[PDB]
Amino acid sequence: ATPSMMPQWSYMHIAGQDASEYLSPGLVQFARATDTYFSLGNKFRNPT
């Protein structure tokens, strides 16, 4: 990519990881557990 601007980009999910590996695993498990009625999916980012 552009390494000199990779850190901040990754910090704010500019081009970093998906919302399944920076999220603490407990939280992702939680969201998958209660997506049916308390979806938190849209609160987060999935950088592409």
Binding site: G26, Q29, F30, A33, T34, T36, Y37
Partner: peptide, 12 residues
């Protein structure tokens, strides 16, 4: 879900 079919949060 779970395996006694559907639900949500008695599974973490």
């Amino acid at each position: 879900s779970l395996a006694p079919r559907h639900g949500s949060r008695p599974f973490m």
